Nucleic acid binder design. Structure first.
Ligand SMILES: [Mg+2]
Ligand SMILES: [Mg+2]
Ligand SMILES: [Mg+2]
Ligand SMILES: [Mg+2]
Ligand SMILES: [Mg+2]
Ligand SMILES: [Mg+2]
Ligand SMILES: [Mg+2]
Ligand SMILES: [Mg+2]
Ligand SMILES: [Mg+2]
Ligand SMILES: [Mg+2]
Ligand SMILES: [Mg+2]
Ligand SMILES: [Mg+2]
Ligand SMILES: [Mg+2]
Ligand SMILES: [Mg+2]
Lengths: 176, 322, 236, 376, 111, 158, 43, 109
RNA sequence: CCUCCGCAUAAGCCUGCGUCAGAUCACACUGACAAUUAACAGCCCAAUAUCUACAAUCAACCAACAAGUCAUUAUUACCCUCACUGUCAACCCAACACAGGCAUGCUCAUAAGGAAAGGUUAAAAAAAGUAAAAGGAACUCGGCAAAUCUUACCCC
RNA sequence: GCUACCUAAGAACAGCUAAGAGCACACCCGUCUAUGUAGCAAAAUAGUGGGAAGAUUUAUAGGUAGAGGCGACAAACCUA
RNA sequence: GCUAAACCUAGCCCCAAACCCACUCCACCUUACUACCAGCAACCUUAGCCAAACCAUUUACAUAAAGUAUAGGCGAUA
């Protein structure tokens, strides 16, 4: 029912509602995948409800009753995501021995800076793909100069940073 | 710019809204050779007639059904020309358009440079009735001019735009199957087929199973009403110069299996707020629920063929202008 | 500079093909030919200039019926719709050719030297000396390139060995192989020459933009040149 | 000469890298990577084919290997096929005789106009919302109206109840001639079907008479000329219905000629020819259905009618089909060519002339009525 | 799920599953005074009408009769101490009709 | 690509000039490759070939900087490879012939691994290297299993 | 005045990222923009 | 003509506006007379579990004690399925013939 | 009292007089909060072959010329249905809340849509209009401008 | 994206007289006068005019670019 | 007495030393920031201002030898 998008009717108009802590990583880590899935859906609905409440508050010009709870929920969700993801990664490592799922290949584009070109997934092979051969992954001589310039710029910035730090240190020393 | 009314609408609870727009009262119920012919018609398209190119579900209601419907119309008419001499004289139109333009209600303009200005909000029903039978003599009355029937019309608690209903500005159009220079200005049996969008299977798939009948009802309310309006216009009559006669017309929407039967009673064109204030009149519509003309076809044999449906059709056809 | 030439139709057809205008611009997009453009819209009728080509899986001399004689917007001469056997085609119309008429196409290099009629095509070897001809090929099987304009004609001057000598519409003369085809008579729409344009508007319609205002001085070239005719050119 | 032009023919592939000629080393190419590179040689990949079979990117086999490709070229007729000539060509194809007037029986079966006028008016002005309806609208409409009017005599004639006009009605018929194979395909027009067959117009003596006059030759415009030359044709003939369909007997082919442009429409002779062909084809199909597939001179010659097209002009045709063995006696069609109700309709008035039709002649209408009646 | 690579469906392979949904929603009071049975949600831009229908039916066990989405432009005309255009985010609104004459009035929170 | 003074006085005008070699197109049979290569070949190249007698010899002898072409380099590499492998260029029925051919070029003939890399660009070389050491990443699970096995063995020993 | 007559399609065809990437000059333009650190590198 | 503002589906002309979309992800293809073909398999159906009789609430009591964190590496996982190996003294060589592929992911989320 | 203007669509722009709260010619300016729902319109169409002579002009006569804008067919291939986007506004290009510029469809006095006059006075000079005795081009470079109109003749 | 010219594929032209015809709307241009001349405006307003079924006007998309383009030469126009 | 004045510390400059930068997910060469279908490809002396009081050959781009030998409208200058 749509009553799931709102909390307990008792809690409407309290200014403060009791919500005890977020799911920590270790606890989450120790629950099972089936359990975890179930937990996710429980979390989700709660999150939705919180969002709705927030929206209502905004509409009303009134402050939230217990906004920290939403944050906690979010944190919990994040933790859950991390745990499951970690597990998946581990599994992948065990099976194929691959870091990440979605593959790439460290490709040097037009502008010469090396992109992690994440692969896009589709039906025909590359050599008879019209829109992918026009995507060029090589520099040509004019780019090198620009790269050099960029590098120089970067170096300048670095120098500025370093010198500034030193100056600050000196100032501090002088003070104390 | 006017609210573009669609008789065969996907909108839910469209009926009440439609009624409000029109100002109707809807009510339940009405105010062997033939059978064989019907069976033959059913068969022809579904079996006997060999298709060249392959038939598809998107292509089903166009290719199979409309022609069958047409056949039913024409053959039936031929049969009943002895039974009724008016249908011999009466013209018949396949897919010819029907347009009608009314004004129902006021609206203070919400925003812009025209804000806080009275705007009489406009409607238009356009239509292509699968086919229709147009007579020169006007049909009878059904129910008397100014019949009370105290059942009450829907509210319209919110804006017309809240229902899926959209405004546009294109040429205004009040028009029957033909133009003014014509003897055959009246009519008595509009046939519709619902599109592929409002197949009952689709409805079932969606949670809207209560809106199966509703759609048909809405359609009946719309197209018929429009036709009536057109007829009225062609014999003078406005909002202000209200109809003296009761303009009547009948119709039978359908689907390949499922038919239902709808007569319309047009007592008013006085839908503007200027006229409504002193208005005891209201337009009427009576109709049956969608009963299947038949169950199913296996090869070249209908499983169960319903004669009751056929009888209704015959009745609709067979009524005369007094 | 986008420029796909419209001439991309590989298959022969009778149907008239949509013609893109050039304006006198090249594929580079610059004007190479001044004073062109802005005329009436036109469609191309594909003209079969290889007069003796046989219909598919046949070899002998090809008879033809004239179905129609029409105006071609693409050119000065008027054109004829020929039919024969299974196939139809457009040819350039000879003078006086009308619908219903029957035409002959031949490959037959006769030692008899058979006389011919104003519509029909023959090898030059079969044609009597002194007959007027049009749509003359340069080589055998090459296709008819010469004497195609409204009202024009060349005349067969003599035969020497396996070659014939033609006088072109410019009286400059041309030696052509005996077996090369031509069609007897003069090109149709004779008196095209006598047409008076009447107004600038007509000229514009024809797709000819006006001359430039810049006053040029006349130079060395501009005196009249009385010369002998250039030496008869051969293709053997 | 070679039409095509070099630039617009697909670009010639760039020359194969010179390393490939050297036997025998591994050419280092950009197929190791998955992008193009200008240094690094061009790789040569094998011709890819797809494992699964998507209909939305389906590539068919060549005309060499198709499941029913024949070597003898068939020649097939259509609604679109519009033949150079003419009535004569059609006759030749069909093997038949053209008589200048409709038969006497039909005429007799005739022996009022306001209705016709109304119908005409309705088609040419009244039916649509916009002013002046176009031909793709009115031409079929007029015909339909006429048909309806004819039907309105069911009160007069009780036998008219046992018919049905149908719209899609595709069909086929295949035969040899000189001998070259020859085919007809179905309609894009209406078809009046009846339970009883039509009666014979000509006697068996008359048919014997036809033998004397030779079918016209007309060189060099040979048949088959304009018809669609075709391989992969399939020789099986076909009526428009499965077995057991009531109202199976083709009374009149109500085909029509819409097309708002002058070019897309038929020219009248061509139209007539087409009609004749249709008549033959349906008749032939009927004959096939009736008798064996083996050819002969017929005992009962089947009759089919076909009205001509267009809102203005009307070509009537009744076809007798008496010989399923072509290549002796021949068939005998008769036509009333280009008879026409009403010359020109003024949808708007003029500045003097009214807004109705003009030059209305009811003879055409009468003829139509007669045609409709034939069986009863 | 939002911000995820979707697997390719070539022709006759498996049904696409979503275990663990990334997008989450919020039902709101309609300002313009909607009719009975129409519930309005603010939705992530990546979510489809169909997805919304599915999402409600599965997780909330609600009978959805119709869904009509609509993207809403968030305002850009707003500037800072720097005179840089702050943009309100564009967002998607749904108008979801409930089935079987279920009906729904939005509750009075913050009484 | 240079400049010329107009009539070879410096006080006359200076104007740019491009001096082109006189190019040709000619076939060359190469004993080591057993194939006829059509080549763009200047007169100078021909002369060089004549001097070194064989085209193959020229290819071999000519120092990489001297040779002046990518194609030439490639050819040289191929020749080297052939020399190394001792692969059948003349197939069977000509082993003696093959041997004889080989004996013509006992000079040169570098180890098989070096001759692969000969006459390459930098980028090409890099690509080759990449190809050589690409592989699939080995499953960590397998490694773990191996480790476990080792541990077990150790335990058994002790 | 009023020499600008906005039309998005034209603009994108004229000055767009794709057009700049098509030519070496265009590429250089983008590189220049990058080097300056400009926020909008193409149109 | 602001090129600081983000390009979007609202911004162009008619033909431009209908092409783009937001990050919506397509349900099907389109054919014939622009008739769209909603394929069931491309639509993601949400596999929702049964929460009836599920004690895990969305928050965790303050009385619950804290523990030291442990990043779940592959080694640990292996160890947690090393008992069988030990007993002997559970792996795919390829997972191409498999519905749920761990590397080039099929499974959504 | 004006209406030499209105409603739409296209293009363009992109929340730019909607609710509440707030401040400082007269009080569309900031902050929050709402808002535009598809059927209209965008977003198309599996191959290989093979076909497309007869304009448009109420298309009927006439009548032409500058020679034109709307077509299939054969065989093979095929069941899955309505996704995604635009849809606000007093609006765009002209630095401006600028007498300018701005495509098409309707409406041709408007059923739309506006306000020429902050208040007084009634001087000069200036601007726009109307008035005119008698004369009537005498004005002036020239009947320029104006109000009634129309004669004859040169030059290019 | 202004203008110069072109290519593609669209659109508009009432009413009266009777054909690059006449009068005359809408549109196009800009003769002469007055006002304006830091202006309503970096070329406008008011009137008065030339054109207005054509060598016309014009919405959209494309093309030619500087030692060049484009030009019914005015050494015009090529974003004040 | 109003307008205003004033105010150090943001940071920056020049060295030194050391070889830098660059995948939370998703998107991004199609009209970039767009989930999903059958064809091309990069290299080619710099010039001119200017100086020679104009202007055409011509004019630079660790220390010491050395501004030496040489070059050069045998001059500017190199
Ligand atoms: Mg001149
Ligand atoms: Mg609007
Ligand atoms: Mg008003
Ligand atoms: Mg005022
Ligand atoms: Mg004042
Ligand atoms: Mg006076
Ligand atoms: Mg004087
Ligand atoms: Mg004057
Ligand atoms: Mg004129
Ligand atoms: Mg005029
Ligand atoms: Mg000009
Ligand atoms: Mg001059
Ligand atoms: Mg100097
Ligand atoms: Mg000087």
């Amino acid at each position: 029912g749509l009553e799931e998008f709102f909390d307990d009717p008792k809690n409407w108009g309290q200014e403060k509602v009791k919500s005890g802590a977020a799911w920590t990583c270790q606890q989450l880590r120790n629950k099972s995948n089936e359990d975890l899935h179930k937990l996710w859906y429980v979390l989700l609905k709660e999150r939705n409800m919180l969002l709705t409440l927030e929206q209502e508050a905004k509409r009303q010009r009134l402050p939230m009753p217990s906004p920290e709870r939403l944050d906690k929920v979010v944190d919990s969700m994040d933790a859950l995501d991390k745990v499951v993801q970690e597990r998946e990664d581990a599994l992948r490592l065990l099976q194929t021995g691959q870091e990440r799922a979605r593959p790439g290949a460290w490709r040097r584009d037009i502008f010469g800076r090396i992109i992690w070109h994440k692969f896009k997934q589709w039906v025909i092979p590359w050599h008879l793909n019209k829109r992918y051969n026009r995507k060029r992954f090589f520099a040509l001589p004019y780019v090198d100069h620009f790269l050099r310039l960029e590098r120089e710029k970067r170096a300048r910035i670095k120098a500025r940073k370093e010198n500034l730090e030193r100056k600050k240190a000196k100032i501090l020393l002088k003070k104390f | 710019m006017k609210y573009m009314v669609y008789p065969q609408t996907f909108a839910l609870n469209a009926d009440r809204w439609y009624q409000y727009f029109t100002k109707t009262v809807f009510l339940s119920g009405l105010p062997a050779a033939l059978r064989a012919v019907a069976c033959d018609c059913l068969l022809q398209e579904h079996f006997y007639l060999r298709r060249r190119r392959r038939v598809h579900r998107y292509e089903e209601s166009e290719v199979i059904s409309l022609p069958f419907l047409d056949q039913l119309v024409s053959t039936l008419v031929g049969l009943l020309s002895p039974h009724n001499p008016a249908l011999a004289a009466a013209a018949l139109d396949y897919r010819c358009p029907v347009h009608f333009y009314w004004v129902r209600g006021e609206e203070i303009i919400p925003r812009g440079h025209r804000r806080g200005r009275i705007d009489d909000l406009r409607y238009q029903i356009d239509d292509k009735p699968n086919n229709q039978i147009r007579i020169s003599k006007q049909l009878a009355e059904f129910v008397p001019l100014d019949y009370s029937v105290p059942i009450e019309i829907p509210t319209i608690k919110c804006k017309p735009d809240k229902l899926p209903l959209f405004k546009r500005q294109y040429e205004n159009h009040i028009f029957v199957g033909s133009k003014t220079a014509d003897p055959c200005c009246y009519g008595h049996t509009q046939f519709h087929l619902l599109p592929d969008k409002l197949r009952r299977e689709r409805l079932l798939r969606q949670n809207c199973a209560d809106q199966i009948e509703v759609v048909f009802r809405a359609n009946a309310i719309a197209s018929l009403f429009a036709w009536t309006g057109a007829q009225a216009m062609y014999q003078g009559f406005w909002s202000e110069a209200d109809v003296t006669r009761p303009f009547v017309s009948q119709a039978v929407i359908t689907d390949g299996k499922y038919f239902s039967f709808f007569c319309y009673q047009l007592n008013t064109l006085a839908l503007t707020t200027q006229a409504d204030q002193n208005n005891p009149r209201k337009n009427i519509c009576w109709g049956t629920q969608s009963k299947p003309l038949y169950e199913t076809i296996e090869d070249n044999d209908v499983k169960g063929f319903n004669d009751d449906v056929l009888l209704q059709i015959v009745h609709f056809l067979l009524n005369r202008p007094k | 500079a986008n420029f796909v030439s419209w001439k991309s139709r590989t298959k022969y057809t009778i149907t008239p093909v949509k013609m893109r205008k050039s304006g006198g611009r090249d594929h580079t997009g610059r004007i190479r030919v001044h004073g062109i453009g802005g005329g009436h819209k036109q469609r191309y009728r594909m003209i079969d200039f290889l007069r003796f080509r046989p219909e598919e899986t046949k070899s002998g001399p090809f008879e033809e019926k004239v179905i129609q004689v029409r105006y071609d917007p693409c050119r000065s001469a008027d054109i004829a719709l020929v039919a024969g056997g299974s196939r139809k085609r457009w040819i350039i119309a000879t003078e006086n050719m009308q619908a219903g008429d029957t035409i002959l196409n031949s490959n037959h290099i006769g030692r008899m030297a058979v006389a011919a009629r104003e519509g029909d095509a023959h090898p030059l070897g079969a044609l009597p000396v002194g007959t007027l001809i049009n749509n003359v090929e340069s080589e055998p099987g090459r296709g008819a390139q010469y004497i195609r304009a409204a009202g024009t004609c060349g005349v067969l001057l003599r035969k020497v060995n396996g070659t014939a000598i033609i006088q072109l519409p410019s009286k400059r003369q041309m030696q052509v192989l005996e077996t090369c085809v031509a069609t007897v008579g003069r090109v149709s729409n004779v008196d095209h020459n006598k047409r008076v344009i009447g107004k600038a508007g007509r000229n514009r319609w024809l797709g000819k933009r006006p001359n430039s205002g810049r006053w040029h001085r006349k130079g060395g070239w501009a005196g009249r040149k009385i010369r002998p005719l250039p030496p008869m050119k051969s293709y053997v | 000469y070679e039409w095509g032009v070099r630039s617009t023919r697909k670009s010639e592939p760039p020359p194969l890298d010179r390393v490939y000629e050297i036997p025998g080393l591994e050419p280092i190419t950009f197929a190791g990577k998955m992008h193009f590179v200008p240094w690094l040689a061009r790789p040569i990949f094998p011709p890819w084919d797809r494992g699964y079979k998507d209909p939305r990117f389906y590539r068919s086999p060549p005309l060499h290997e198709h499941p029913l490709y024949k070597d003898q070229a068939c020649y097939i007729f259509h609604h679109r096929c519009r033949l150079l000539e003419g009535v004569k060509q059609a006759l030749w194809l069909t093997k038949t005789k053209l008589i200048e007037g409709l038969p006497e029986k039909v005429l007799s079966l005739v022996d009022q106009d306001e209705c016709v006028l109304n119908v005409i008016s309705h088609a040419r002005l009244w039916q649509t919302t916009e002013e002046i309806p176009k031909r793709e609208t009115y031409c079929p409409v007029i015909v339909d109206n006429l048909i309806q009017l004819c039907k309105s005599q069911i009160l007069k004639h009780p036998s008219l109840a046992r018919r049905i006009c149908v719209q899609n009605s595709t069909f086929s018929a295949t035969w040899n001639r000189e001998s070259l194979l020859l085919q007809v395909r179905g309609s894009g027009g209406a078809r009046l079907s009846t339970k009883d067959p039509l009666p014979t117009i000509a006697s068996r003596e008359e048919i014997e008479a036809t033998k004397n006059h030779v079918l016209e030759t007309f060189y060099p415009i040979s048949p088959i000329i304009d018809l669609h030359e075709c391989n992969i044709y399939d020789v099986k003939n076909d009526t428009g219905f499965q077995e057991g369909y009531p109202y199976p007997y083709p009374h009149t082919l109500y085909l029509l000629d819409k097309a708002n442009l002058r070019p897309h429409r038929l020219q009248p002779d061509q139209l007539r020819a087409k009609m004749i062909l249709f008549a033959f084809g349906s008749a032939l199909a009927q004959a096939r259905l009736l008798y064996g597939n083996d050819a002969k001179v017929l005992e009962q010659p089947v009759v089919v009618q076909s009205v001509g097209t267009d809102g203005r002009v009307f070509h009537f045709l009744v076809f007798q089909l008496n010989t399923t063995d072509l290549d002796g006696v021949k068939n005998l069609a008769w036509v009333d060519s280009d008879q026409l109700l009403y010359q020109h309709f003024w949808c708007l008035p003029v500045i003097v002339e009214p807004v109705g039709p003009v030059g209305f002649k009811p003879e055409t209408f009468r003829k139509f009525l007669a045609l409709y009646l034939h069986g009863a | 799920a939002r911000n995820v690579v979707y697997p390719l469906y070539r022709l006759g392979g498996p049904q696409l599953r979503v275990f663990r949904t990334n997008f989450f929603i919020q039902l709101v009071r309609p300002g313009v005074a909607q009719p009975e049975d129409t519930v309005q949600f603010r939705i992530p831009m990546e979510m489809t009408r169909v997805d919304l229908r599915n999402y409600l039916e599965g997780i909330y066990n609600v009978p959805v009769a119709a869904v009509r989405t609509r993207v809403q432009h968030g305002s850009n005309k707003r500037r800072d101490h720097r005179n840089v255009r702050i943009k309100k985010p564009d967002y998607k609104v749904a108008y979801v009709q409930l089935a079987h004459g279920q009906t729904f009035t939005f509750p009075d929170l913050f009484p | 690509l240079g400049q010329i003074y107009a009539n070879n006085d410096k006080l006359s005008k200076r104007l740019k000039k491009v001096w082109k070699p006189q190019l040709f197109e000619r076939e060359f049979y190469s004993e080591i490759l057993d194939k006829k290569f059509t080549v763009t070949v200047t007169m100078r190249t021909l002369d060089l070939i004549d001097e070194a007698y064989g085209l193959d010899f020229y290819i071999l002898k000519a120092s990489g900087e001297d040779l002046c072409s990518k194609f030439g380099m490639d050819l040289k590499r191929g020749m080297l490879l052939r020399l190394a492998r001792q692969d059948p260029q003349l197939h069977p029925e000509d082993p003696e012939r093959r041997a004889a051919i080989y004996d013509k070029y006992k000079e040169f003939a570098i180890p098989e691994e070096e001759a692969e890399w000969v006459g390459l660009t930098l980028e090409e070389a890099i690509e080759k290297q990449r190809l050589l050491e690409e592989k699939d990443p080995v499953p960590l699970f397998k490694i773990y299993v191996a480790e476990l096995i080792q541990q077990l063995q150790q335990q058994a020993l002790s | 005045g009023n020499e600008y007559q906005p039309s998005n399609i034209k603009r994108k065809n004229k000055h767009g990222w794709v057009r700049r990437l098509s030519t070496p000059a265009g590429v250089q333009v983008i590189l220049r923009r990058m080097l300056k650190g400009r926020k909008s590198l193409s149109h | 003509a602001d090129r600081m503002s983000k390009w979007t589906s609202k911004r162009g002309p008619r033909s431009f506006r209908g092409r783009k979309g937001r990050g919506a992800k397509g349900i099907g293809f389109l054919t014939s007379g622009w008739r769209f073909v909603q394929i069931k398999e491309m639509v993601p159906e949400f596999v929702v579990p049964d929460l009836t009789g599920f004690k895990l609430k969305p928050y965790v009591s303050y009385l619950a004690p804290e523990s030291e964190e442990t990043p779940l590496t592959a080694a640990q996982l292996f160890s947690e399925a090393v008992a069988p190996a030990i007993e002997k003294d559970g792996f795919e060589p390829t997972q191409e013939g498999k519905l749920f592929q761990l590397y080039p992911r099929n499974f959504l989320r």
